[PDB]
Structure formats: structure tokens, C-alpha cells
């Protein structure tokens, strides 16, 4: 129904570092600066 980017649902990482694992670039939680959140499988 709804989800939020935190830990289990997802993680927050910088743009300079690309998501190693096959994660889906998703943004749900307002992270600091131009950060990017990834969605776990």
C-alpha cells in the first residue's frame, strides 16, 4: 500500500557511489543533500 525508505525497506547512499547490488532507485524518505535511496529486493 505504502512504504518508506529507511533500512529494511531501503537504504540511503550518496550519488558518487552507485548501488552495487541490483537495487531499484527509489526515493521515499527525504534524505540530506542530493542523496539517493535504493529499494531492496
Describe this entry's structure for a reader.
- A three-stranded antiparallel β-sheet has the order 1-3-2, with no helix packed on it.
- The radius of gyration is 10 Å and the shape is flat.
- The chain starts with 9 loop residues before the first strand and ends with a strand.
- The protein has strands spanning 10-13, 24-25, 36-39.
- By secondary structure, the protein is mainly beta.
- It is classed as unknown function.
Share of β-strand residues: 15-25%
Structural class based on helices, strands and sheet pairing:
mainly beta
Summed up, the helix count is 0
Shape: flat
As a whole number of angstroms, the C-alpha radius of gyration is: 10 Å
Order of the strands making up the biggest sheet: 1-3-2
Distance between the termini: 16 Å
Q: What is the element string, with H for helices and E for strands?
A: EEE
Helix content: under 10%
The total beta strand count reads: 3
Domains counted in the coordinates: how many? 1
Biggest sheet layout: 3 strands, antiparallel
Amino acid at each position: 500500500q505504502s512504504e518508506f525508505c529507511g533500512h529494511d525497506v531501503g537504504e540511503c547512499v550518496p550519488p558518487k557511489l552507485v548501488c552495487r547490488p541490483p537495487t531499484h532507485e527509489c526515493l521515499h524518505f527525504p534524505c540530506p543533500g542530493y542523496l539517493k535511496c535504493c529499494c531492496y529486493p
